[PDB]
């Protein structure tokens, strides 16, 4: 079964950029709820219940017809939030092989940032913006609700290994930013954990 | 040119059910943004710009290809919130012809409320739950993001003339209910404007 993961920091570690009350709520309520609803759906699927969530969401089409939606949504939610927390940290510097590949695939870091901001802002309703690795090339993609590019193009409309990503569901920014998702997106650059993105790139490039 | 409609009541007129702080942010920030972004997209379209928003969303297939998405999203937002505000009021009662119609089509009011509650809760991500009139038969449906049944099935996945509706985007309930959407859905019964729903049923158009 799944559990709510412990975090790489206290809820206040991303201040003054991301507010600690949202961090706490986001973890103990929203993420906890995906874990709980996934666990309920997995109760009758002992074979699938053993998989890592990040693997299960690559295998949705193998589930029973009546379980696919609820696990796409909840396992997706669990996988995406588990990744998200790892990708937040202050004080990092984009550098090394990851910086070089971003420059290569988008022309410059600023270009990538503009493209990422645009995908994040233009995702209408709930969803995520991502930096994915598609074989030998990095790309910016977005998905709806709790879909993940790990689910594949057919299900999610995107594909690739997520290097990093931004939650743009309203619960992630309402308290501090209300409807100003662009302001939230700007603050994200101060807490993007480039060290984690770098480690993930190193594992997969 | 669209304009943000003033509300038919003060921001605290739906207390203690729907919280006044949310009403003001919802109206003056979120709905304002749909008005502004729709207007922006319509400036180059004099043949569409001055039509009633509820007319525009019936003719999205008539638009230029590059305009269909932005106006589906923002004209739908404007149309939907305009309905919503008028479709909220304390001190009304489900009764008369509409009450009898609902009993006819759903078996009883409680059956209907259960179905509405179910559709409102099961809309994963952002969206709306609706009571619609599909040629003389009332139905419960929901849509994603700012889609409206008035847009038709191909676009919105639903159809029929909206009688009333509930906004289940997170911003509508985050401050007072956080992630507890079933709790917000229960409170909606205390503020749904059954008089305006009855007038709309009466008109059937
Ligand atoms: O989606 Mn948090
Ligand atoms: O969706 Mn207000």
From Swiss-Prot, chains A, B:
Keywords from the named record: Manganese, Metal-binding, Oxidoreductase
Q: How is the cofactor bound?
A: Binds 1 Mn(2+) ion per subunit.
Subunit structure, per the record? Homodimer.
Gene Ontology cellular component annotations, sorted alphabetically = cytoplasm; cytosol
Residues reported to bind Mn(2+): 26, 81, 167, 171
Q: Which PROSITE patterns match?
A: SOD_MN
Which reactions does this protein catalyse? 2 superoxide + 2 H(+) = H2O2 + O2
State the organism of origin. Answer: Escherichia coli (strain K12)
This chain's protein is named Superoxide dismutase [Mn]
